[PDB]
Design a protein around this ligand. Structure first.
Ligand SMILES: [Mg+2]
Ligand SMILES: [Mg+2]
Length: 133
RNA sequence: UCGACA
DNA sequence: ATGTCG
C-alpha cells in the first residue's frame, strides 16, 4: 500500500514484440537514471523485463545496497523468483543475443546470493513506473 | 477459454 | 497485434 521511495525501479522499452528491447534502472524517488542497456535488436517484452531485474540485482549487490527493486512485470518477477526465464521465443540466429543475455542472467542468479525484495509496482494505483520510457 | 500483468 | 502467468 505504501510506495517504498528508497528503491530502484526498472522497466523495459521496446519497439515491436518480439522487437527491439532495451531497459533502464532509475532511482524511484529522484528519477535519476542509474543504468541503461544497449538496445538488443530482437527480444520479447518479458525477456527485457527479466534482464532489467537481474541487472538491478547485480547493480545493488555491487554497491552493497539493501534497497528493494520495483518492476511492473508479473512475468519477470516470477521468473527471477524461480531463477528461470520460461520464455517461448524461438532460439535461432537472430535471437541469439537476447538468449545469451537471458542465459547469462539465469547463470548469475544461480551462482550468487541476495536478499533484495522484488516488489510489484502497482500501476493501477500509482501510475506509470518511474523507469517507464 | 476466462481472469491478470506488460 | 504478441509475450506470459493464475
Ligand atoms: Mg513494463
Ligand atoms: Mg509502461
Amino acid at each position: 500500500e505504501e510506495i517504498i521511495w528508497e528503491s530502484l525501479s526498472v522497466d523495459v522499452g521496446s519497439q515491436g514484440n518480439p522487437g527491439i528491447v532495451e531497459y533502464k534502472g532509475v532511482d524511484t524517488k529522484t528519477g535519476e537514471v542509474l543504468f541503461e542497456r544497449e538496445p538488443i535488436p530482437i527480444g520479447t517484452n518479458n525477456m527485457g523485463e527479466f534482464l532489467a531485474i537481474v541487472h538491478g540485482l547485480r547493480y545493488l549487490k555491487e554497491r552493497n545496497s539493501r534497497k528493494p527493486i520495483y518492476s511492473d512485470s508479473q512475468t519477470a518477477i516470477k521468473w527471477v523468483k524461480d531463477k528461470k526465464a520460461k520464455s517461448t521465443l524461438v532460439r535461432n540466429e537472430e535471437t541469439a543475443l537476447i538468449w545469451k543475455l537471458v542465459d547469462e542472467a539465469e547463470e548469475w542468479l544461480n551462482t550468487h546470493t541476495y536478499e533484495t525484495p522484488i516488489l510489484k509496482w502497482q500501476t493501477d494505483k500509482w501510475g506509470a513506473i518511474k523507469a517507464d520510457y
